[PDB]
From a paper:
To parasitize a phage, the SaPIs employ a transcriptional repressor, Stl, which in addition to repressing the SaPI genes, senses an active phage infection by binding to the phage-encoded anti-repressor protein. Here, we show that the phage satellite SaPI2, which does not encode orthodox anti-phage defense systems, provides antiviral immunity mediated by Stl2, the SaPI2-encoded transcriptional repressor. Stl2 targets and inhibits phage-encoded HRs, including Sak and Sak4, two HRs from the Rad52-like and Rad51-like superfamilies. Here we have focused on two recombinases, an annealase called Sak, and a recombinase called Sak4, belonging to the Rad52-like and Rad51-like superfamilies respectively.
We struggled to obtain a good quality cryo-EM map of full-length Sak80α. The full-length dataset presented two major challenges: severe particle orientation preference and the absence of the flexible CTD, which is a common issue with Rad52-like annealases. Consequently, we decided to focus on a truncated version of Sak80α where its CTD was removed, Sak80α∆CTD. The data set of Sak80α∆CTD exhibited improved behavior. The 2D averages from this dataset revealed stable ringed structures of different sizes, with octadecamers being the predominant form, which was used for the final reconstruction. It shows the groove commonly seen in SSAPs to accommodate ssDNA in the outer surface of the torus, known as the ssDNA binding groove or ssDBG. Truncated version of each protein where their CTDs were removed (Sak80α∆CTD, SSB80α∆C7), proved that these two proteins coordinate their functions via their CTDs.
Author numbering:
A (entry chain A), B (entry chain A), C (entry chain A), D (entry chain A), E (entry chain A): 4 to 131
Write the structure that this text describes.
Amino acid sequence: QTLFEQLNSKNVNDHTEQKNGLTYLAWSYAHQELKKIDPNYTVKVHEFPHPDINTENYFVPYLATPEGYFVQVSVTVKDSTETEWLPVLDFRNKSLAKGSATTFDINKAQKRCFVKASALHGLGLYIY
Amino acid sequence: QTLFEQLNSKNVNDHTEQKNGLTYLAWSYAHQELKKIDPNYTVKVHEFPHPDINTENYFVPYLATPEGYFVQVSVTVKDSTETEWLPVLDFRNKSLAKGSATTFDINKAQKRCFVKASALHGLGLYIY
Amino acid sequence: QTLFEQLNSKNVNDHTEQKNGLTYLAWSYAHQELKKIDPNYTVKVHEFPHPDINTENYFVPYLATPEGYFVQVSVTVKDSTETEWLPVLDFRNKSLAKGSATTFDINKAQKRCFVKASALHGLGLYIY
Amino acid sequence: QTLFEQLNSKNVNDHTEQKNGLTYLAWSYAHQELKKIDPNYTVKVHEFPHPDINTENYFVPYLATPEGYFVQVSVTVKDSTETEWLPVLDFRNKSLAKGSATTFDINKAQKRCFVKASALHGLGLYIY
Amino acid sequence: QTLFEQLNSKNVNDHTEQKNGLTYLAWSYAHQELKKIDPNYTVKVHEFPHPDINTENYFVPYLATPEGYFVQVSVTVKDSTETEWLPVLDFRNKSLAKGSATTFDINKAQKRCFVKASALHGLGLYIY
């Protein structure tokens, strides 16, 4: 068949967490399923220059913008790349203004952006 | 036949949400239908220099203008590219002035601009 | 025959909205009719430097002038290009002074300029 | 015969509006008559540097002079170009001083300058 | 015979207006008579740098001098060019000082300078 249809036709319902009334598939499950399909696949978290620090060659792993925070994750399986963006959010799914976000929030957003970019491939597309 | 007519003759009415009295087709449905027609298609969100931050090589994913906010999405299916613009808007469909928009608003506008650019292709043109 | 006469001899009266006592043909209808005649046609919205912001490589999609706002749309069907200009206007068809226009107004003016440039081709010339 | 005589010998009286006691032929009629004679003809609205704004590569579609406003339209039919100038005027046909003209006034003057330049060709010369 | 004698021996008395006790032949009549004699003839309105505005590449269509206003028109029929100058004047045929002239006055002076330059050719020389 094809990668999209094979991956799309799977049930990731069992490995999900209901937090805030939303459904999330854990990254651990996503990491193994793609690993099975393709043994060698790449996950890259983009790094962007920081607006406040002017030191040269200083690149943080997230985008800080005057309006908030952004993350980017690029998942490449079998020579196909799917990029994704996401806003960093609170535990209550509310936006975080400049200077109100901790490093633990960014890491959670980075992990969440990975499982969503994988959903651009057939796996668990129905949840999003 | 042709891509426009094939895509135009589909019913996307079932997968729609009535919010504020407007009809919207979910991106998830748009992502799969184009994926079926063409296995390898590209979605690109344009990035523009930011008016307030003067750091070099700093590119946000939206356009901030003294009059408001703009987003752009370019969808390429089978070597044909359809670009689209849209204003970032509130939950009540009202405009957001400079310094009043959160990152969650931009992401929603980005997703909405994707399904509208896909409607430039035959799919779900009737809604817009 | 010829493109002008074929396009000119059509009834776009059914797909019109009477707002403020003026007659407007919806863009959706214009997008499909030209798409039928020519499968591959281009719509380009011109981008102009902004008078107030001095950042380099900053190009907004409209013209802000000390006297008001202008938009431009270039529609190319079958290797023929028809450019058009229009003033951005209120819901009451009144002019908007510098600093009084929202991004929702510009987008409406951009869509309206598209259907008028298409009317430079035979389609719906009688309305304007 | 010749273009001037053919075009000159036409009755554009039916398609005229009596406003302020003057006679005007609508642009829509002018656009179709020249289109018939010549399928491919060009209309160009000249763009001039603006006296107040010093930004580079900033070109408005009208001429603002310390004494008032000017517009220019160049109509080319069958390899012959007829340029024309006109002052931007009020609804009462009075002059507009620097800083008193809206974008709606400029557009009306641009359309009027087009039908007058076409009158340099035989069509509707008698009105002016 | 010759262009001067042929053109000189015509009666333009019928197409004249008596304003302020002077006789003027309308431009419309002049435009058609030369058009008949020569199908392709050129009218050029000279453009001069403006004394007050220092912006580069800014050229108005008239000459503003500390003593008043001047216009120039060059009419070329059959490879012969006749230039002409004229002062911009009020409705009462009085001079206009720097900063007292509107764009409507300049346009009237431009049209009048055209019919006088044509009178350098035989047509209607007797009036001036």
